């Protein structure tokens, strides 16, 4: 009965510039078991129009998922991914840093 | 193209 904590990356599908249609991705990988809960956040608040990829796994048996939503960058809107999983007592929250 | 038949463990 192994448990593996998810790795999380939050990033846009194309280069971010304020004002142009883009997609916000939340890539979760390396976890087990498969029950996982993931939300995309705009200014602390949960976004409703969110799709996700079909559950697959890697050679070491761990699961990975893509969550994504249409969005439009602005100088002052903040975006974040929020993730909960049996291995997490406290929901993890990773901010979108474009400046990467 | 999926494998045609499957055996239980």
């Amino acid at each position: 009965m192994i448990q593996r904590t998810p790795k999380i990356q939050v990033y846009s599908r194309h280069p971010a510039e304020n004002g142009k249609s883009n997609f916000l991705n939340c890539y979760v990988s390396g976890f087990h078991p498969s029950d996982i809960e993931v939300d995309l956040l705009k200014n602390g608040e949960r976004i409703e129009k969110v799709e996700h990829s079909d559950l697959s796994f890697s050679k070491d048996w761990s699961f990975y998922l893509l969550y994504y939503t249409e969005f439009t960058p602005t100088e002052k809107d903040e975006y974040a991914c929020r993730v909960n999983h049996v291995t997490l007592s406290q929901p993890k929250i990773v901010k979108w840093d474009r400046d990467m | 193209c999926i494998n045609g038949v499957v055996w239980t463990v």
């Binding site: 192994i2 280069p15 | 494998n3 038949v5 499957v6 055996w7």
Partner: protein, 274 residues
Amino acid sequence: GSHSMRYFFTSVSRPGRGEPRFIAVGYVDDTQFVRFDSDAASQRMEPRAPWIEQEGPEYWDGETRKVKAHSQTHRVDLGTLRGYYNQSEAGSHTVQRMYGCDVGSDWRFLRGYHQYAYDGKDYIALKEDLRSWTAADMAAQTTKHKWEAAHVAEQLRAYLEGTCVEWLRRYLENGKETLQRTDAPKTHMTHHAVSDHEATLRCWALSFYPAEITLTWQRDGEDQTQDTELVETRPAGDGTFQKWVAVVVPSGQEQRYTCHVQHEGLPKPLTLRW
């Protein structure tokens, strides 16, 4: 050059009521092309690539029929495995299965695999020679005897060297526009200042396909792994991939550092400077 086709099955029991959630996906190289989801209304294998749509309703009925047979196999497996391991009827458990075939640059069989896990841990797997089994523990030893006696390895081997390869060849052809096109990474470097004596250089690779790639930093013509951070390769969401790698350097010394990119989509290793 090389290509692969891989199928992925997961089953997750739901204690309390009903059959396990079941999720199947098929992949060619890095492109997903089919899926079945037990919690979806169609109750059919469903196309997830434009090039597979060409296929007729007899492909879709046969694939459905086999993918449904699999889930019932997985359902039975969870019950038996739960007996082998003396576990309760109350916990939630998972079986995973993966199989597929690889072909080199001639599209001839090269490698084949078929393996099984229980709660995320090796259970049983087919050997490289496709004739015998690796059983990780005694419960899998039981299964191996059963499969040895009823000749499972033989059947699988014929599929993996036969069918699998032939339809891979089929897919590669009908899908050449995407499946045989390499998308070379588009690269650029960013620069960021942390304090007044120390900088960060970030070397990016975007929109490349397939997923496999190498990004490395050099210092005065030598490899350098210290003070460098390498992110897991990630899907962009449009069928391509991204990855970056970073190095921390002293301010003013930016120019001794070169990022090196290797991708099947590039004639030769690309080199970037600041």
